[PDB]
Write a protein that binds this DNA or RNA. Structure first.
Length: 88
RNA sequence: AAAA
């Protein structure tokens, strides 16, 4: 599933890009104070769900990333994640 | 779901 994993990885990395985060108020409101978001929330986003509903594949796509980091069931931008959370 |  390497090709599909690459598309998934790059799609999710876009959500965690600075360009997207500057405008993505929904994503920032779902962040905890340390910037973490449930991976299953990301899995529900339409462009990811179109590609797969296989949660292990999504996890595998994200371990291959230099943009995001995973802790247990959550994911955040590696660089200055505390910059981004917003009040509900 | 203006790539939430």
């Amino acid at each position: 599933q390497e090709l599909l994993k690459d598309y998934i990885k790059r799609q999710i990395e876009y959500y965690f890009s600075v360009d997207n985060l500057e405008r993505d108020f929904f994503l920032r409101r779902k962040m905890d104070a340390d910037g973490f978001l449930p991976i299953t929330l990301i899995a529900s986003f339409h462009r990811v769900q179109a590609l797969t509903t296989d949660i292990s594949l999504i996890f595998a796509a994200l371990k291959d990333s230099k943009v995001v980091e995973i802790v247990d069931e959550k994911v955040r931008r590696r660089e200055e994640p505390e910059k981004w959370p917003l009040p509900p």
